[PDB]
């Protein structure tokens, strides 16, 4: 099965797994418990297969929204942090690791979209979405544009649509209501209507995808884009003097990007649940533990208040956390696959003009 007296940890190959092993070495140095950190291929789907056998790692690191399915299959142990520890993490991150009212993982890091802007073209980026049309008029007169971001993917257009009241599934008391969907309320209509109006008035092009936006910003052709921390490295090499800030408001309300919380779950089959709890609470989720991982591969914003306040000296990370706190936790239920397909069709249909915004959002709500 899973052998006792040691910890096996699975984490994806793009994370700082050697820094995590350094934290595992400190744990072993204090307790004699060997901690081995591996990054298998196809990790997201290998864990359910290997855990449902009774096998697998003791701890698995993944985006919170996948853990919902794990917990549904009874693959994750309910965790037992006390009030003092829970108070060390930002409260919204705990909401990301609830399934049917129960905590099933420890939040580690926090990720969301931000407003990325060219300081040379735009030293004072707009605070509101309603400012962009006039701003695009000015920059059109200089051979530039105000804003280009991926319109083909709902993940990128959702911050605007959700600003004035849209939502995927309503979250209440650690549970999602599958029957309360907020893609067709007045807030979503107002947001998508603005998106389409920006396209009609020639301020954005409806075919703009990831590649077009990324090259357009990194070549100095647009003053702003919308992207996440995974994108900063390409901008660094592009020699564009860029900043990262809070997304514009819409109708005075913050933009609501989806939030992904990298979290550590404990295998229900683990005979080392108490050792995992001790490692995760007393060694990893500390300033020293998160710093070891971050120095390997940057975590971005982190759920641990004390270390985030240090990381937030980087205003890009501060902006990521601000947009996360104002955002929508990505639901951890299987019906999100229907939400993606539905919202994707509606945005493409509304942005293409093949359908009005009202007609578009009525169809997305119905299946």
């Amino acid at each position, epitope marked *: 099965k899973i052998e006792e007296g040691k910890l096996v940890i699975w984490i*994806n*190959g*793009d994370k700082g797994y050697n820094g995590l092993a350094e934290v595992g070495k400190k744990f072993e140095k204090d307790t004699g418990i060997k901690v081995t950190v591996e990054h298998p*291929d*196809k990790l*997201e*789907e290998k864990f359910p297969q290997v855990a449902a056998t009774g096998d697998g790692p003791d701890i698995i690191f993944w985006a919170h929204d*996948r853990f919902g399915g794990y917990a549904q299959s009874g693959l994750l142990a309910e965790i037992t942090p006390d009030k003092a520890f829970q108070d060390k993490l930002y409260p919204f991150t705990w909401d990301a690791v609830r399934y049917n009212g129960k905590l099933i993982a420890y939040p580690i890091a926090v990720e969301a979209l931000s407003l990325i802007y060219n300081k040379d073209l735009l030293p004072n980026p707009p605070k509101t979405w309603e400012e962009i049309p006039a701003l695009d008029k000015e920059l059109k007169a200089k051979g530039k544009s105000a804003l280009m971001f991926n319109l*083909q*993917e*709902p*993940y990128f257009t959702w911050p605007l649509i959700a600003a004035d009241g849209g939502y995927a599934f309503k979250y209440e008391n650690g549970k999602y209501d599958i029957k309360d969907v907020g893609v067709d309320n007045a807030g979503a209509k107002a947001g998508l209507t603005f998106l389409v109006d920006l396209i009609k008035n020639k301020h954005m092009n409806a075919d703009t*995808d*990831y*590649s077009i936006a*990324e090259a357009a910003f990194n070549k100095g052709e647009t003053a702003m884009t919308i992207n*996440g921390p*995974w994108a900063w490295s390409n901008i660094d090499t592009s020699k564009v003097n860029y900043g990262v800030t809070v997304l514009p408001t819409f109708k005075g309300q913050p933009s609501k990007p989806f939030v*992904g919380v990298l979290s550590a779950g404990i295998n229900a089959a683990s005979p080392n649940k108490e050792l995992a709890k001790e490692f995760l609470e007393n060694y990893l989720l500390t300033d020293e533990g998160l710093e070891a991982v971050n120095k390997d591969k940057p975590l971005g914003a982190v759920a641990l208040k004390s270390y985030e306040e240090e990381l937030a000296k980087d205003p890009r990370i501060a902006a990521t956390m601000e947009n996360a706190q104002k955002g929508e936790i990505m639901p951890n239920i299987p019906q*999100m*696959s*229907a939400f*993606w*397909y539905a919202v*994707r*069709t509606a945005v*493409i249909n509304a942005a293409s003009g093949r359908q009005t915004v009202d007609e578009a959002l009525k169809d997305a709500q119905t299946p």
Partner: nanobody, 125 residues
């Protein structure tokens, strides 16, 4: 669980071509992204080609752009990698992958939740 069965592999000479296939089974309707990745002996896994399943947009690594084409037959639930003008550096284990949503460039592999078996395309000089 979305499942992928892989096929199409082979060993051919340079200047020849090959067509890889990858059959998708299950809840495959809501998929938004399909990609082909390869891993050379003892190297990193590399995005080769990706396809946004909705409006059919395509993305290609510089190494294969203009030589490879990714295509999806919806009526047959099968994504193809047409590999024209094969070079010896095309030798690698090739994987296909699927995802519902994507925050990143479609050519980045950590994006994708589902994966195939990995077949050894071999191209000799």
């Amino acid at each position: 669980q979305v499942q992928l069965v892989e096929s199409g592999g082979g060993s051919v000479q340079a200047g020849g071509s090959l067509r890889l296939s990858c059959a998708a089974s299950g809840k495959i309707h809501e998929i938004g992204y399909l990609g082909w990745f390869r891993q050379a002996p003892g190297k990193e896994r590399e995005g080769v080609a990706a396809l946004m399943t909705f409006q059919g947009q395509t993305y290609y690594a510089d190494s294969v752009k203009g030589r490879f084409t990714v295509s999806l037959d919806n009526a047959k639930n099968t994504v193809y990698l047409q590999m024209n003008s094969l070079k010896p550096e095309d030798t690698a284990l090739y994987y296909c992958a699927a995802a519902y949503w994507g925050k990143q460039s479609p050519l980045i592999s950590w994006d994708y939740s589902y994966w195939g078996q990995g077949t050894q395309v071999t191209v000799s000089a």
